[PDB]
Amino acid sequence: KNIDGYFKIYSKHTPINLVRDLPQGFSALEPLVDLPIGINITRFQTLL
Amino acid sequence: KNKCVNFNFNGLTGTGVLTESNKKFLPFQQFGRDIADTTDAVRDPQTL
Ligand SMILES: *[C@@H]1O[C@H](CO)[C@@H](O)[C@H](O)[C@H]1NC(C)=O
């Protein structure tokens, strides 16, 4: 989330055993990064 | 420690007695709060 030009990045890694979709349940994501880019973001893309 | 002091941690001001905690702050955390919205515990900027 980019708020007031703040790029806040939270994340979480968890082991899973499922090939269908998101496992049903609950787990919280801890903050990792806050970048002061001051840059408006309207779109994004993924790279594999 | 173990004395009444006027403490200022990175601008977080208050008055109290500083004692060794048994709390488990997460890697990103700086200071705790109480139900009253008062600082209950802190992390030293110079020592983790
Ligand atoms: C949004 O764009 C404007 C362009 O004037 C800029 O001043 C502002 O800092 C930007 N804010 C964010 C959310 O990065």
CSV table of N, CA and C and ligand atoms in Angstrom, one decimal:
chain,number,residue,atom,x,y,z
A,1,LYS,N,0.8,-1.2,0.0
A,1,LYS,CA,0.0,0.0,0.0
A,1,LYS,C,0.9,1.2,0.0
A,2,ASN,N,0.6,2.2,-0.9
A,2,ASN,CA,1.3,3.4,-1.0
A,2,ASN,C,0.4,4.6,-0.5
A,3,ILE,N,0.7,5.0,0.8
A,3,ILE,CA,0.0,6.0,1.4
A,3,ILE,C,0.9,7.2,1.7
A,4,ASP,N,0.4,8.4,1.3
A,4,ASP,CA,1.2,9.7,1.5
A,4,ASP,C,2.6,9.5,0.9
A,5,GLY,N,2.7,8.8,-0.2
A,5,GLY,CA,4.0,8.5,-0.8
A,5,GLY,C,4.8,7.5,0.0
A,6,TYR,N,4.1,6.8,0.9
A,6,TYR,CA,4.7,5.7,1.7
A,6,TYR,C,4.5,4.3,1.2
A,7,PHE,N,5.5,3.6,0.6
A,7,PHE,CA,5.3,2.2,0.1
A,7,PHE,C,5.5,1.2,1.2
A,8,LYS,N,4.4,0.8,1.8
A,8,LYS,CA,4.4,-0.1,3.0
A,8,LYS,C,4.2,-1.5,2.4
A,9,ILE,N,5.1,-2.4,2.8
A,9,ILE,CA,5.2,-3.8,2.3
A,9,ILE,C,5.2,-4.7,3.6
A,10,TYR,N,4.1,-5.5,3.7
A,10,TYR,CA,4.0,-6.5,4.7
A,10,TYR,C,4.0,-7.8,4.0
A,11,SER,N,4.4,-8.9,4.6
A,11,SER,CA,4.5,-10.2,4.0
A,11,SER,C,4.5,-11.3,5.0
A,12,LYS,N,4.2,-12.6,4.5
A,12,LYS,CA,4.2,-13.7,5.4
A,12,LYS,C,4.4,-15.0,4.5
A,13,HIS,N,5.3,-15.9,4.9
A,13,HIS,CA,5.5,-17.1,4.3
A,13,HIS,C,5.0,-18.3,5.2
A,14,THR,N,4.3,-19.2,4.6
A,14,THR,CA,3.7,-20.3,5.3
A,14,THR,C,3.8,-21.6,4.5
A,15,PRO,N,4.0,-22.8,5.1
A,15,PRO,CA,3.9,-24.0,4.4
A,15,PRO,C,2.5,-24.4,4.2
A,16,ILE,N,2.2,-25.1,3.1
A,16,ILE,CA,0.9,-25.5,2.6
A,16,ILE,C,1.0,-26.8,1.9
A,17,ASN,N,-0.2,-27.5,1.9
A,17,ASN,CA,-0.4,-28.7,1.1
A,17,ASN,C,-1.7,-28.7,0.4
A,18,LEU,N,-1.7,-28.0,-0.7
A,18,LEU,CA,-3.0,-27.7,-1.5
A,18,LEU,C,-2.6,-27.2,-2.9
A,19,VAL,N,-3.3,-27.7,-3.9
A,19,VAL,CA,-3.0,-27.5,-5.3
A,19,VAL,C,-4.2,-26.7,-5.9
A,20,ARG,N,-5.2,-26.4,-5.1
A,20,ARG,CA,-6.5,-25.8,-5.7
A,20,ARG,C,-6.4,-24.3,-5.6
A,21,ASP,N,-6.5,-23.8,-4.4
A,21,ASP,CA,-6.6,-22.3,-4.2
A,21,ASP,C,-6.1,-22.0,-2.8
A,22,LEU,N,-6.5,-20.8,-2.3
A,22,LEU,CA,-6.0,-20.3,-1.0
A,22,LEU,C,-6.5,-21.2,0.1
A,23,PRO,N,-5.7,-21.8,0.9
A,23,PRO,CA,-6.2,-22.5,2.1
A,23,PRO,C,-7.0,-21.7,3.0
A,24,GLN,N,-8.1,-22.3,3.5
A,24,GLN,CA,-9.0,-21.7,4.4
A,24,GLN,C,-8.5,-21.7,5.9
A,25,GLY,N,-8.5,-20.5,6.5
A,25,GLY,CA,-7.9,-20.3,7.8
A,25,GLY,C,-7.4,-18.9,8.0
A,26,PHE,N,-6.5,-18.7,8.9
A,26,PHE,CA,-6.1,-17.4,9.4
A,26,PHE,C,-4.6,-17.3,9.8
A,27,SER,N,-4.0,-16.3,9.3
A,27,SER,CA,-2.6,-16.0,9.6
A,27,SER,C,-2.3,-14.5,9.3
A,28,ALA,N,-1.4,-13.8,10.1
A,28,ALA,CA,-1.3,-12.4,10.0
A,28,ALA,C,0.1,-12.1,9.2
A,29,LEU,N,0.1,-10.9,8.5
A,29,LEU,CA,1.2,-10.5,7.8
A,29,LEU,C,2.0,-9.4,8.5
A,30,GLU,N,3.3,-9.6,8.8
A,30,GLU,CA,4.1,-8.7,9.5
A,30,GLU,C,4.7,-7.7,8.5
A,31,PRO,N,4.8,-6.4,8.9
A,31,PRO,CA,5.5,-5.4,8.1
A,31,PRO,C,7.0,-5.8,7.9
A,32,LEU,N,7.5,-5.5,6.7
A,32,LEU,CA,8.9,-5.7,6.4
A,32,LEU,C,9.6,-4.4,5.9
A,33,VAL,N,8.9,-3.6,5.1
A,33,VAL,CA,9.5,-2.5,4.4
A,33,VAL,C,8.6,-1.3,4.4
A,34,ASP,N,9.2,-0.1,4.5
A,34,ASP,CA,8.5,1.2,4.2
A,34,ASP,C,9.5,2.1,3.4
A,35,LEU,N,9.2,2.1,2.1
A,35,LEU,CA,10.0,3.0,1.2
A,35,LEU,C,9.4,4.4,0.9
A,36,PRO,N,10.1,5.5,1.2
A,36,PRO,CA,9.6,6.8,1.0
A,36,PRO,C,9.7,7.3,-0.5
A,37,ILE,N,9.2,6.6,-1.4
A,37,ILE,CA,9.3,6.9,-2.8
A,37,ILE,C,8.7,8.2,-3.2
A,38,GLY,N,7.6,8.6,-2.5
A,38,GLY,CA,6.8,9.7,-2.9
A,38,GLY,C,6.2,9.6,-4.3
A,39,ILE,N,6.0,8.4,-4.7
A,39,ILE,CA,5.6,8.1,-6.1
A,39,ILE,C,4.2,7.6,-6.1
A,40,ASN,N,3.3,8.2,-6.9
A,40,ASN,CA,1.9,7.8,-7.2
A,40,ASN,C,1.9,6.5,-7.9
A,41,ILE,N,1.2,5.5,-7.5
A,41,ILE,CA,1.1,4.2,-8.2
A,41,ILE,C,-0.4,3.9,-8.5
A,42,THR,N,-0.7,3.6,-9.8
A,42,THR,CA,-2.0,3.4,-10.4
A,42,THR,C,-2.2,2.0,-10.9
A,43,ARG,N,-1.1,1.3,-11.3
A,43,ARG,CA,-1.1,0.0,-11.8
A,43,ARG,C,0.2,-0.7,-11.4
A,44,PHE,N,0.2,-2.0,-11.6
A,44,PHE,CA,1.3,-2.9,-11.2
A,44,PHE,C,1.2,-4.2,-12.1
A,45,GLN,N,2.3,-5.0,-12.0
A,45,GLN,CA,2.4,-6.3,-12.7
A,45,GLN,C,3.3,-7.2,-12.0
A,46,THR,N,3.2,-8.5,-12.3
A,46,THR,CA,4.0,-9.5,-11.7
A,46,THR,C,5.0,-10.1,-12.7
A,47,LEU,N,6.1,-10.6,-12.2
A,47,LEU,CA,7.2,-11.2,-13.0
A,47,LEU,C,7.5,-12.6,-12.4
A,48,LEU,N,7.4,-13.6,-13.3
A,48,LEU,CA,7.7,-15.0,-13.0
A,48,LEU,C,9.0,-15.4,-13.8
B,1,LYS,N,18.4,2.5,35.6
B,1,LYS,CA,17.1,1.7,35.7
B,1,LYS,C,16.7,1.6,37.2
B,2,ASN,N,15.5,1.1,37.4
B,2,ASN,CA,15.0,0.8,38.8
B,2,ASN,C,14.9,2.1,39.6
B,3,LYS,N,14.6,3.3,38.9
B,3,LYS,CA,14.5,4.6,39.5
B,3,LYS,C,13.5,5.4,38.7
B,4,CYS,N,13.0,6.4,39.4
B,4,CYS,CA,12.0,7.3,38.8
B,4,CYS,C,12.8,8.3,38.0
B,5,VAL,N,12.5,8.3,36.7
B,5,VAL,CA,13.3,9.2,35.7
B,5,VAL,C,12.3,9.8,34.8
B,6,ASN,N,12.8,10.9,34.2
B,6,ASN,CA,12.1,11.5,33.0
B,6,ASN,C,12.9,11.0,31.8
B,7,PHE,N,12.2,10.1,31.0
B,7,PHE,CA,12.8,9.4,29.9
B,7,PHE,C,12.3,10.0,28.6
B,8,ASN,N,13.2,10.0,27.6
B,8,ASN,CA,12.9,10.4,26.2
B,8,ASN,C,13.6,9.5,25.3
B,9,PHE,N,12.8,8.6,24.7
B,9,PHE,CA,13.2,7.7,23.7
B,9,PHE,C,12.8,8.1,22.3
B,10,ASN,N,13.7,8.7,21.5
B,10,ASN,CA,13.4,9.2,20.1
B,10,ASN,C,12.3,10.2,20.1
B,11,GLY,N,12.1,10.9,21.2
B,11,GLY,CA,11.0,11.9,21.2
B,11,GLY,C,9.8,11.4,22.0
B,12,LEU,N,9.7,10.1,22.2
B,12,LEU,CA,8.7,9.5,23.1
B,12,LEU,C,9.0,9.8,24.5
B,13,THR,N,8.3,10.7,25.1
B,13,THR,CA,8.6,11.3,26.4
B,13,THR,C,7.7,10.6,27.4
B,14,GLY,N,8.2,10.6,28.7
B,14,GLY,CA,7.4,10.2,29.8
B,14,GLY,C,8.2,10.2,31.1
B,15,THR,N,7.6,9.8,32.1
B,15,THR,CA,8.2,9.7,33.5
B,15,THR,C,7.8,8.3,34.0
B,16,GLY,N,8.8,7.6,34.6
B,16,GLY,CA,8.5,6.4,35.2
B,16,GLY,C,9.8,5.7,35.7
B,17,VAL,N,9.6,4.4,36.0
B,17,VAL,CA,10.7,3.5,36.4
B,17,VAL,C,10.9,2.4,35.3
B,18,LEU,N,12.1,2.4,34.8
B,18,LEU,CA,12.5,1.5,33.7
B,18,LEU,C,13.1,0.2,34.3
B,19,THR,N,12.5,-0.9,33.9
B,19,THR,CA,12.9,-2.2,34.4
B,19,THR,C,13.0,-3.2,33.2
B,20,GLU,N,13.8,-4.2,33.3
B,20,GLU,CA,14.0,-5.2,32.3
B,20,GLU,C,12.7,-5.9,32.1
B,21,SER,N,12.3,-6.0,30.8
B,21,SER,CA,11.0,-6.6,30.4
B,21,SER,C,11.1,-8.1,30.0
B,22,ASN,N,10.0,-8.8,30.0
B,22,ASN,CA,9.9,-10.1,29.5
B,22,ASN,C,9.0,-10.2,28.3
B,23,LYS,N,8.8,-9.0,27.7
B,23,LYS,CA,7.9,-8.9,26.5
B,23,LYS,C,8.5,-9.4,25.3
B,24,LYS,N,7.7,-9.7,24.2
B,24,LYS,CA,8.3,-10.2,23.0
B,24,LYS,C,7.9,-9.3,21.8
B,25,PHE,N,8.6,-8.1,21.7
B,25,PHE,CA,8.4,-7.2,20.6
B,25,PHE,C,8.8,-8.0,19.3
B,26,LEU,N,8.1,-7.7,18.2
B,26,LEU,CA,8.5,-8.2,16.9
B,26,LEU,C,9.6,-7.4,16.3
B,27,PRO,N,10.3,-7.9,15.2
B,27,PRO,CA,11.5,-7.2,14.7
B,27,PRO,C,11.2,-5.8,14.3
B,28,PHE,N,10.0,-5.4,13.9
B,28,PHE,CA,9.6,-4.1,13.5
B,28,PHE,C,9.2,-3.2,14.6
B,29,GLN,N,8.9,-3.7,15.8
B,29,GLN,CA,8.3,-2.9,16.8
B,29,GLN,C,9.2,-2.0,17.5
B,30,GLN,N,8.7,-0.9,18.1
B,30,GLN,CA,9.5,0.1,18.8
B,30,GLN,C,9.0,0.2,20.2
B,31,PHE,N,7.7,0.4,20.4
B,31,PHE,CA,7.1,0.6,21.7
B,31,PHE,C,5.7,0.0,21.9
B,32,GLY,N,5.4,-0.4,23.1
B,32,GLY,CA,4.2,-1.0,23.5
B,32,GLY,C,3.2,0.1,23.9
B,33,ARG,N,2.0,-0.3,24.2
B,33,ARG,CA,0.9,0.5,24.7
B,33,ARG,C,0.1,-0.3,25.7
B,34,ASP,N,-0.6,0.4,26.6
B,34,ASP,CA,-1.5,-0.1,27.5
B,34,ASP,C,-3.0,0.2,27.0
B,35,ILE,N,-3.9,-0.4,27.6
B,35,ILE,CA,-5.3,-0.2,27.4
B,35,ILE,C,-5.7,1.2,27.4
B,36,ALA,N,-5.0,2.0,28.2
B,36,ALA,CA,-5.2,3.4,28.4
B,36,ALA,C,-4.6,4.3,27.2
B,37,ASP,N,-4.0,3.6,26.2
B,37,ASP,CA,-3.3,4.3,25.2
B,37,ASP,C,-2.0,5.0,25.7
B,38,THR,N,-1.5,4.6,26.8
B,38,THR,CA,-0.2,5.0,27.4
B,38,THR,C,0.9,4.0,27.0
B,39,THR,N,2.1,4.5,26.8
B,39,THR,CA,3.3,3.7,26.6
B,39,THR,C,3.5,2.8,27.8
B,40,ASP,N,3.6,1.5,27.7
B,40,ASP,CA,3.8,0.6,28.7
B,40,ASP,C,5.2,0.0,28.7
B,41,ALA,N,5.8,0.0,27.5
B,41,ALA,CA,7.2,-0.5,27.3
B,41,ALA,C,7.8,0.0,26.0
B,42,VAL,N,9.1,0.1,25.9
B,42,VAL,CA,9.8,0.7,24.8
B,42,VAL,C,11.0,-0.2,24.4
B,43,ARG,N,11.6,0.1,23.2
B,43,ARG,CA,12.9,-0.4,22.8
B,43,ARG,C,13.9,0.7,22.7
B,44,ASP,N,15.1,0.5,23.3
B,44,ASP,CA,16.1,1.4,23.3
B,44,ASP,C,16.7,1.6,21.9
B,45,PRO,N,16.7,2.9,21.4
B,45,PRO,CA,17.3,3.1,20.0
B,45,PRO,C,18.8,2.6,19.9
B,46,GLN,N,19.5,2.7,21.0
B,46,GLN,CA,20.9,2.3,20.9
B,46,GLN,C,21.2,0.8,21.2
B,47,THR,N,20.2,0.2,22.0
B,47,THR,CA,20.3,-1.2,22.3
B,47,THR,C,19.0,-1.9,22.0
B,48,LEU,N,19.1,-3.1,21.3
B,48,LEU,CA,17.9,-3.8,21.0
B,48,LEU,C,17.3,-4.6,22.1
C,1,LIG,C1,0.9,12.3,-5.9
C,1,LIG,O1,1.3,13.1,-7.1
C,1,LIG,C2,1.5,14.5,-6.7
C,1,LIG,C3,1.8,15.2,-8.0
C,1,LIG,O2,1.7,16.6,-7.8
C,1,LIG,C4,2.7,14.6,-5.7
C,1,LIG,O3,2.8,15.9,-5.3
C,1,LIG,C5,2.4,13.7,-4.5
C,1,LIG,O4,3.5,13.7,-3.6
C,1,LIG,C6,2.1,12.3,-4.9
C,1,LIG,N1,1.7,11.5,-3.7
C,1,LIG,C7,1.9,10.2,-3.6
C,1,LIG,C8,0.8,9.4,-3.0
C,1,LIG,O5,3.0,9.7,-3.9
